Design a binder for this molecule. Sequence first.
Ligand SMILES: [Mg+2]
Ligand SMILES: [Zn+2]
Lengths: 152, 98, 266, 166, 162, 39
Amino acid sequence: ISHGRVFRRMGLGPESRIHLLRNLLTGLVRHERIEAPWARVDEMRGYAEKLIDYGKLGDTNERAMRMADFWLTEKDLIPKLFQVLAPRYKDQTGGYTRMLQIPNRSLDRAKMAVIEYKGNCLPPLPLPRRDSHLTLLNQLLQGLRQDLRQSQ
Amino acid sequence: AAPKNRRTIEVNRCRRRNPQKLIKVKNNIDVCPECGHLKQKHVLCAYCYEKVCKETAEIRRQIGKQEGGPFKAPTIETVVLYTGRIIERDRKRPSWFT
Amino acid sequence: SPTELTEMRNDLFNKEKARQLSLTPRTEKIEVKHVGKTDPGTVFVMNKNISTPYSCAMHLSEWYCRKSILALVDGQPWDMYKPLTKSCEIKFLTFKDCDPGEVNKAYWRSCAMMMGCVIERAFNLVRAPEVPVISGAFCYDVVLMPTKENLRSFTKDAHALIYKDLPFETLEVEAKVALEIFQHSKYKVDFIEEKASQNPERIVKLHRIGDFIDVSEGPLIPRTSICFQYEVSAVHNIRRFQGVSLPVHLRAHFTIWDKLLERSRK
Amino acid sequence: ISRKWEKKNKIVYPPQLPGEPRRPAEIYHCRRQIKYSKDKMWYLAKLIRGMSIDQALAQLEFNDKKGAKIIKEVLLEAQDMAVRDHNVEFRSNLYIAESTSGRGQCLKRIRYHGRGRFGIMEKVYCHYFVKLVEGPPPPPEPPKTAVAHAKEYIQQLRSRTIVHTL
Amino acid sequence: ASQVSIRRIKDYDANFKIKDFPEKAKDIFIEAHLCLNNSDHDRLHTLVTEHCFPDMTWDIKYKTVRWSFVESLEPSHVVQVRCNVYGQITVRMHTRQTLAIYDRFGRLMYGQEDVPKDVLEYVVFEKQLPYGSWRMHTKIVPPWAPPKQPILKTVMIPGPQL
Amino acid sequence: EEGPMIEQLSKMFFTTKHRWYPHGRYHRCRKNLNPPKDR
Ligand SMILES: [Mg+2]
Ligand SMILES: [Zn+2]
């Protein structure tokens, strides 16, 4: 039984799992993109968002700083987190982290995934579009909407 | 425990040629509207994703070159300029970076 | 008479086709290029009055065949099954492009034609009106009161036709020939004349669905099977019959479909 | 070691009369000594069987299995052959008539078991076979209706005799 | 130069006359084409050289051709001749030739069986000078003849893949 | 639809389900296509 039970069981224990998560987070901070196995990626994203929120609170808060220290192993990244990422997302609330599939990893045939903080500096991912508005069904829908508007 | 008699070939066929064990004929597959190389729904196009990855790698290399050793990570949002903080590539811009 | 007429028209069409075939001297070859966002920069070495853009599609893959509907050759829409005269540049058009307006119109035309066909058997046809997509229907004007049962029957007929899965045969013909074909129907004749007047070449565009034949301005969709959800909404007083229909590649789903139908009904 | 599949591409059927059905292009191709188990190959083969080349290719692309890649490669090669050497005009018009897996020559090794004991590992190989035919993939079995069943039953009923007497 | 070559050939052989040669050449050609229909590699090799044999037998493999011959236009002409010791003659030919190339399965991929077409040829012959003979070496694709017969099947030419 | 169809058939003809279920390949191969017909 495992009803209402968040947190997947990643490494060789919970500490290990946490460590793994941290590494991923660090990588993300460094890079602003990671190819990683999809099951851990979501966890990372969850943690990542929280981390960014924490960073937003500002350098001067000690708790936040401590958290940053804990989670960013490479240490140069803490300034980046404070003096860049936070600045970038001051307007947003929790839209950060964009998480999409990758075909499949070649050797073990795992489910894979990408994880970028939103916007960022790298070439854009080939995102899944919605169908264009000029298509038949869409056009019909638009017409219907117009009619409704006219009625009211 | 040990098999008391040899499993007959007919039986075996029935067991292992049954529709639960046969590979399903999937219907996720659509054409890649840019690039045309064919891809799954819910997944990034493999070919389309490849170019992007390559681009990232080259940009990464350039970044590395710029930032001498490890432990740098500066306080500027970087930009990638091709031919007219800054990272200076080369070539024309592709028909997707904008 | 309706038993004679259809056969006669078909025969005429066949004759015309034969005549058309006659002109080319034993397999004349042309090099038709593919302009496109994907699979470039291919060229297909085709046989000119026989081979269509469907052949080209086939050469490329099966996917193209499945999803292509109009073939922009030198920036003008050919039908998938209408032959490629001379060396030119092809693009294939789906429902799901950035600019799918040409396709939509064609689809509408096809739907109208289907409706007309349904009408002709079920029991004189003036024209198919040039209706947009935002107008929320494809209509067809008919000179002769129908109940819901009648409508249902009509719908069923349409469905049957779709199932039968007939290719939309195409010809660009002399005006005289067209007149000869439709001399019994006056409105049709008038329409043909108008069309002739419109262009410098007389070049009347005849389209055919097995037994049924009709005139129309634009190109048409390859086959009737591309229509998936097809219904006949209502008739309004000449009597304009209306319809709304969504293809494979854009399925509406129940509630949405119902809404669409309702909209059409107005 | 025998190889008749390879040979099969070297047949010459005597030429047709004008008033005669087209006679579609059959095309045979293999891969020998693939490192895989035959039964595993068989599932993939089964998955491919009735399908158009293109559809089969698509399926293979997204089937995450070692052998799938190999089969895809084989299919591609077959397609190429058809277009070049075997005078098939449209790639899209090729469907897979047959696909089967034979066992290749297998190498015996020692497995080294607990206690003093040991098994003999057999390192397995396969031959993958394909036959492509020209023309669209034939329509599958339409599942026989109640009516058909009834008809059959009626026929059966009719068919009986008085058995023994005369 | 041609005259000199001829003289040399005469000296080599020795008995040789070019007044009758064109006809002989034509006959040889005809024989070769007949052989091609019947797939006689045994017969072919007495005609046609080791350079030309593989050039006219590789493409045509597993596929049945249905050649025939009819009324040669103009007389059989002989243009330039020249000369280890392996000699060379060139022959101009203007004939009516039927061509019908059928595939492994049957079918028909090149030309009409019954309808004869009028063809131009610049056929080069060679000979070894102990037990040699005059055999075909090359077919010179000049002057600038009006293309070929067009191919029946449609073709796709793939562009540069990326 | 299968089971329902079978049931319907049974109802029609008064018989058990077991005969309407389709028998295997071997058995069909065995069956004589050109039996010796008499009278
Ligand atoms: Mg020991
Ligand atoms: Zn793509």
